[PDB]
Amino acid sequence: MHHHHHHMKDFIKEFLNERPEVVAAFGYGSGVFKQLGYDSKEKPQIDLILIVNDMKLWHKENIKKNPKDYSFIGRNFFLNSSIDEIKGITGITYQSNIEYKGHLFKYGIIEYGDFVRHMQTWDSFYVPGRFQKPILTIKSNNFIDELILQNRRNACKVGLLCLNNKDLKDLYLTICNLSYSGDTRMKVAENPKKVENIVGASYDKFNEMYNFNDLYQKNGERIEYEIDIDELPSSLEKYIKDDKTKEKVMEYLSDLNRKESSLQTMKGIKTN
Ligand SMILES: Nc1ccn([C@@H]2O[C@H](COP(=O)(O)OP(=O)(O)OP(=O)(O)O)[C@@H](O)[C@H]2O)c(=O)n1
Ligand SMILES: [Br-]
Numbered sequence: 001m002h003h004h005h006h007h008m009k010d011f012i013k014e015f016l017n018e019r020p021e022v023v024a025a026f027g028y029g030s031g032v033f034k035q036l037g038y039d040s041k042e043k044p045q046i047d048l049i050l051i052v053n054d055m056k057l058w059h060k061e062n063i064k065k066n067p068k069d070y071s072f073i074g075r076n077f078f079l080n081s082s083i084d085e086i087k088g089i090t091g092i093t094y095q096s097n098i099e100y101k102g103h104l105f106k107y108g109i110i111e112y113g114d115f116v117r118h119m120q121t122w123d124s125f126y127v128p129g130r131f132q133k134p135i136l137t138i139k140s141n142n143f144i145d146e147l148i149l150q151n152r153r154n155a156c157k158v159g160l161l162c163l164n165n166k167d168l169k170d171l172y173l174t175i176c177n178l179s180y181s182g183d184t185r186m187k188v189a190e191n192p193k194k195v196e197n198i199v200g201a202s203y204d205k206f207n208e209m210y211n212f213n214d215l216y217q218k219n220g221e222r223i224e225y226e227i228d229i230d231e232l233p234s235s236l237e238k239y240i241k242d243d244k245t246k247e248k249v250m251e252y253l254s255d256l257n258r259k260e261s262s263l264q265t266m267k268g269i270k271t272n
């Protein structure tokens with residue numbers, strides 16, 4: 001009689017319905033999927049990721065329909081600066097603390113093509129890492145769903161490679177951690193607790209997401225697998241060709257997580 005995901009999806013569609021159309025749309029994060037370790041009563045932001053055809057024109061059209069989605073700085077940023085500066089290295093731009101119906105929304109915009117390239121090749125890891133956690137689908141298609149699956153499969157290969165103990169919960173934690181290693185906006189103390197608080201409260205969703213019995217098999221709480229990383233996304237595979245170990249894979253990923261979270265936090269003031 002109550003399906004959380006139908007009720008959230010409807011509310012989010014209301015928000016999007018005042019905004020220029022998108023190719024696909026997804027909810028994620030603590031405003032969409034519960035997390036342990038929040039004090040009740042904390043009203044976290046509803047985090048969304050929207051895929052568009054043309055970054056410049058989606059924003060231009062939304063600056064006329066919803067000008068209050070943007071600071072003064074930010075409108076000039078989106079209308080004046082080069083597309084290369086706007087996309088930056090992650091390809092995604094964030095509007096935060098957007099108020100709608102007693103809630104706060106924070107959405108990111110990414111062009112279709114940058115989404116495809118990043119998901120397939122991991123030349124950037126910022127967005128593909130977020131798609132390794134629970135995703136509420138609002139609007140998608142077969143092709144994008146298959147991108148999402150391959151990205152999880154390759155995350156799972158990397159997870160199995162890094163794992164020391166053959167324990168299921170720790171595979172889920174290792175996977176969920178890939179995009180958090182090296183993140184510059186997470187205080188040191190809370191970094192391990194954030195990952196635990198996500199997996200702890202969405203264990204079911206993780207069960208569905210990483211249900212790949214050709215890579216590893218579940219026996220209660222432990223798993224059996226043989227390491228297989230022979231096909232990985234092209235930029236990480238290129239990076240590791242002479243040193244295919246867990247250490248070099250984590251080197252690549254956390255280097256990207258450090259550089260990208262830092263650039264993403266700078267771009268965020270230029271666009272509020
Ligand atoms: N380095 C990071 C940071 C975040 N994410 C994912 O993307 C969402 C990021 O939303 P964010 O608002 O940063 O984290 P929240 O979990 O929503 O915490 P908060 O209440 O502070 O918004 C997270 O849920 C997490 O799954 C990630 O995978 N890698
Ligand atoms: Br568009």
Ligand SMILES: [Br-]
Nearest residue numbers: 088089090263
């Ligand atoms: Br960037």
Ligand SMILES: [Mg+2]
Nearest residue numbers: 029030045047
């Ligand atoms: Mg959030």
